[PDB]
UniProtKB/TrEMBL annotation:
<dbReference type="GO" id="GO:0070773">
    <property type="term" value="F:protein-N-terminal glutamine amidohydrolase activity"/>
</dbReference>
<dbReference type="GO" id="GO:0008418">
    <property type="term" value="F:protein-N-terminal asparagine amidohydrolase activity"/>
</dbReference>
<feature type="binding site">
    <location>
        <position position="211"/>
    </location>
    <ligand>
        <name>L-glutamine 1</name>
    </ligand>
</feature>
<dbReference type="InterPro" id="IPR003010">
    <property type="entry name" value="C-N_Hydrolase"/>
</dbReference>
<dbReference type="Pfam" id="PF00795">
    <property type="entry name" value="CN_hydrolase"/>
</dbReference>
<feature type="binding site">
    <location>
        <position position="209"/>
    </location>
    <ligand>
        <name>L-glutamine 1</name>
    </ligand>
</feature>
<feature type="binding site">
    <location>
        <position position="51"/>
    </location>
    <ligand>
        <name>L-glutamine 1</name>
    </ligand>
</feature>
<dbReference type="GO" id="GO:0030163">
    <property type="term" value="P:protein catabolic process"/>
</dbReference>
<feature type="binding site">
    <location>
        <position position="211"/>
    </location>
    <ligand>
        <name>L-glutamine 2</name>
    </ligand>
</feature>
<feature type="binding site">
    <location>
        <position position="176"/>
    </location>
    <ligand>
        <name>L-glutamine 2</name>
    </ligand>
</feature>
<dbReference type="InterPro" id="IPR036526">
    <property type="entry name" value="C-N_Hydrolase_sf"/>
</dbReference>
<feature type="binding site">
    <location>
        <position position="57"/>
    </location>
    <ligand>
        <name>L-glutamine 2</name>
    </ligand>
</feature>
<protein>
    <submittedName>
        <fullName>Nta1p</fullName>
    </submittedName>
</protein>
<dbReference type="InterPro" id="IPR039703">
    <property type="entry name" value="Nta1"/>
</dbReference>
<feature type="binding site">
    <location>
        <position position="176"/>
    </location>
    <ligand>
        <name>L-glutamine 1</name>
    </ligand>
</feature>
<feature type="domain" description="CN hydrolase">
    <location>
        <begin position="7"/>
        <end position="427"/>
    </location>
</feature>
Length: 431
């Protein structure tokens, strides 16, 4: 049975700096106030914050992050999310540095329900170089899904109001989760987006601290003090030229609340990566994010792949996580050469978006992608891309970027300003 759904999605984009937790919280409440006073404000069903939203990101040592870590149900990030959730009667998702009882540290995203109860805590699964500075752990469960109960958000297709409840299957992916494992795995594994398609995820939520490519990332540059000083001067000039302090913009809010302005489809060019025009999205990254969700995108060649059975071995051979991942370090552990039957789960598996039974498993389905990316700069070396946005994969029957009309760009914030975007998102699920 087809169920129509309407979700009001609010994304908050922040520029948190290390040691400014109280200030960032105050700016957060200021943003939310301005959101409610907007002409086309409507109450959100879900509010999403970035990765490490209140604390800043670039911690260089375990000692430096320890004053900001919290248990999953204590501390400033949890209390903030609970207060927001109670005052807006919504789900609230926020990224925060976590410590558990056994003194292990994670990069995490907690979920609070409209009653102020914590229903989920997701830990980052693919780690970035920065996480290794402070002894961050990989999520031992690997990628995960969870139910979200939405009240009064659904209807049958002939009904005239959204008066039914719906439980959506959701998944959280934190920034690097979207990348090939350790940047070393094959690009076309698309591990996270394949997992979401495999598990029929409907709502994809991504707190991120994702870089603009003006950032200094070259390893030989970072470890040669002469090259590093020169590189740092280049970034300083780029910020100064934009009339920005080195840390980037704070406290000047771009608000796109309830409008229906869509983001223009643009292919990536040698201009699209420049850190200029702070109120416009970084389309080099928008196109790249869309590409990392390739299994959700229409692609003509899949019919040939399916007809020639070119991917059957890739599909059968694929494991749940990379073999060297934390997932298999405790607990978890050839169908063609066996008398074991083919289970339903194997028929749900995909590679490059193709399954054993269909050229394109996602065809005819809907999914919503919500990306909350931080903005600003850290260490004089690292420029975050901002450009938080909401996307709809419509499953309708080419290009590997925003020109592909099987994805809908429902709206983005700019690459460099703090702010908020609210969109009503309409899509269908099957029950």
């Amino acid at each position: 049975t087809k169920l129509l759904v309407s979700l009001k999605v609010l994304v908050i984009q922040l520029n948190p700096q290390i040691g400014q937790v109280d200030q960032t919280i105050k700016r957060t409440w200021s943003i939310l106030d301005k959101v409610t006073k907007s002409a086309t404000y409507v109450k959100p069903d879900i509010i999403l914050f970035p990765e490490f939203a209140l604390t800043g990101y670039s911690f260089h040592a375990r000692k430096d992050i320890l004053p900001y870590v919290t248990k999953k149900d204590e501390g400033p990030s949890f209390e903030l999310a609970k207060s927001i959730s109670e005052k807006f009667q919504c789900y609230t998702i926020i990224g925060y540095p976590e410590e558990d009882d056994e003194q292990k540290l994670y990069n995490s995203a907690l979920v609070v329900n409209p009653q102020g109860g914590q229903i989920f805590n997701y830990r980052k699964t693919f780690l970035y170089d920065t996480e290794m500075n402070w002894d961050c752990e990989e999520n031992p469960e690997g990628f995960q899904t969870f139910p979200m109960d939405f009240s009064k958000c659904a209807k049958l297709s002939n009904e005239d109001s959204y008066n039914r409840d719906v439980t959506l299957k959701a998944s959280i992916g934190i920034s690097m989760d979207l990348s090939p494992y350790k940047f070393m795995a094959p690009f076309n594994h698309f591990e996270f987006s394949s997992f979401c398609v495999d598990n029929n995820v409907e709502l994809i939520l991504c707190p991120m601290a994702w870089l603009n490519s003006t950032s200094i990332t070259d390893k030989q540059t970072l470890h040669n003090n002469s090259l590093l000083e020169a590189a740092k001067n280049k970034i300083a000039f780029a910020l100064k030229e934009q009339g920005l302090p080195l840390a980037g913009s704070q406290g000047i809010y771009q608000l796109k609340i309830g409008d229906s302005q869509r983001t223009p489809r643009v292919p990536s060019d040698d201009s699209t990566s420049e850190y200029k025009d702070m109120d416009e999205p970084d389309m080099s990254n928008v196109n790249y994010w869309i590409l990392r969700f390739f299994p959700f995108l229409y692609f003509k060649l899949r019919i040939n792949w399916f007809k020639n059975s070119s991917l059957i071995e890739s599909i059968l051979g694929k494991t749940r996580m990379p073999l060297d991942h934390e997932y298999y370090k405790d607990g978890k552990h050839d169908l063609l050469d066996s008398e074991e039957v083919i289970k339903d789960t194997v028929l749900e598996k995909t590679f490059l978006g193709t399954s054993l039974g269909q050229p394109w498993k996602f065809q005819g389905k809907n999914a919503i992608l919500v990306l909350a990316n931080r903005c600003g700069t850290e260490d004089g070396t690292t420029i975050f891309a901002g450009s938080s946005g909401i996307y709809k994969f419509n499953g309708k029957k080419s290009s590997l970027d925003s020109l592909n009309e099987s994805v809908e760009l429902l709206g983005n914030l700019g690459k460099g300003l703090e702010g908020a975007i609210l969109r009503e998102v309409q899509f269908e699920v099957f029950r």
